[PDB]
Subunit: 168 residues, 4 copies
């Protein structure tokens, strides 16, 4: 039903925390985009399980893209994941990808430490163009403030915004 | 202490309601644009300014646009010699409601306000974009209502 | 065929000059939005609003030319566009929506505060406005200038204006 | 003295055509995204041109991974003056795509503006060009002209 595509870190990370507030209680598909060390910028995304991820995403009506804001954009893992949709749109193993994605609802959770409420707007507008291209309805988002793990818990505005993320 | 600069039409409209949610318990001064000099005199006396405007064509109301545009005259008015200095120490907020996916399509307007405030040296402390079509509709926008109620809180 | 909606100050104005170049040679319908008593010292007048609509409705290409005031369009252009809400339900112009949905739109905006960057929100606001109307946003020019004649120094803008249509 | 940081590949494609129009006559260094070696080469140039095809209304994945790594460089003891060195450089952006890029690529330009501002680098200019298939960029006369004059400080 609901999938959370996490392009941040895991266990404690501000991205994980905010996402849990948004999907609390649901039996949501939790996707974590893998990355291997070569810490921000110290990794390289791993996409060995990309097809498995697409398979899971296709079964979900609601998609929540959760990401830290790196250099005023999304994470390296989420950027390489979305860029690969270009390949999937030409993939015979997922012949109805465009149509299937077009009926889904999308949400975004992004956390940054440099006045995200303002400096994170270009990223939200970028997501707007991405979803519009796919015909996906961009239903809502949350911009949260945080630098180190767990500091999002101090952004009460973001915590309550995430809890009220899913439209009703 | 707090001034709500109302750019719509005083009539229990969605923008008015959302701004009231933000200032509940603060006993703010409500300035309805829709007497320019008196308005300027009144806002200069407030530390916090909340610009509340319905969203028209992905921007502010024509009333609020004519109001801010006239600041160009005030920046050179000898009766208000310290206008820019006084404004720069104020904290500004924006509350805007519209019926066409405003939380997403109203972002350019938020960026314009960011530039206006930065130009004046004012701190842009927060904003809330809300969704509504007919009066009262905003009371169903849980996310917006929650955000407005927390707008001016120092610790919640 | 082509219409230039000018929301600035005429003759010699940076906005007038760039628009002039964009439609140089063409027999374009020149629409100037009225205003009477310098920035912020006027009040737009729309007594001729209906005749202006009648004219743009006959043009396939619409060029919106405006100075950048407070990071937005001019007061006259803002009040003009805002009124489209009334026109969209006006018995006098039964087909406004459909007629506008087939026109091509362009924007020429001039500002004195690093417009190539600070004028982007305005261009994005125009993108939403045109998309709402079904109008194709074909291109734009962001010129730098604050005083009459200044736009003659922005050769990059004059070029663009020339290569706009 | 100047470097073109290409986030595409060496292929003589639309982004490369536009970038070349800008550095013609400058004998610029062409870097096609040896990370440490690349950082050393760019640190020696006072003008940096970031050239990238537009993917999903953003930069290429290759350029994204490169700029993201600056976070590591900002804390790398082997490059103790990285931030300071970059701050005195002039940055330009050349970006080409086939989905109404001059309009839909604006958020990307704003991101670059934030990236450069964070580094203290002067964002001197940019060109968004239209091109769907190889060679299409030659039809975008506005972009070709803008790229031609991008680094010029004289006219005719
Ligand atoms: Pt994080
Ligand atoms: Pt469903
Ligand atoms: Pt990473
Ligand atoms: Pt106060
Ligand atoms: Pt405005
Ligand atoms: Pt002018
Ligand atoms: Pt035509
Ligand atoms: Pt005016
Ligand atoms: Pt040089
Ligand atoms: Pt290309
Ligand atoms: Pt990017």
């Amino acid at each position: 039903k609901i999938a959370v595509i996490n392009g941040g870190t895991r266990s404690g990370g501000n991205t994980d925390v905010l996402a849990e507030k948004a999907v609390q209680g649901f039996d949501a598909e939790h996707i974590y985009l893998q990355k291997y060390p070569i810490a921000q910028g110290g990794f390289r995304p791993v996409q060995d399980d990309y097809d498995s991820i697409i398979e899971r995403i296709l079964q979900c009506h609601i998609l929540i893209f959760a990401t830290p804001i790196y250099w005023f954009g999304m994470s390296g893992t989420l950027k390489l994941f979305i860029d690969r949709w270009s390949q999937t749109l030409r993939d015979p193993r997922f012949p109805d990808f465009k149509q299937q994605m077009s009926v889904k609802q999308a949400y975004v959770i992004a956390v940054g430490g440099d006045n995200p409420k303002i400096k994170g707007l270009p990223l939200i507008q970028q997501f707007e163009h991405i979803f519009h291209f796919m015909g996906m309805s961009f239903k809502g988002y949350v911009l949260g403030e945080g630098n180190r793990p767990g500091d999002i818990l101090r952004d009460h505005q973001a915590l309550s915004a995430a809890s009220r993320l899913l439209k009703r």
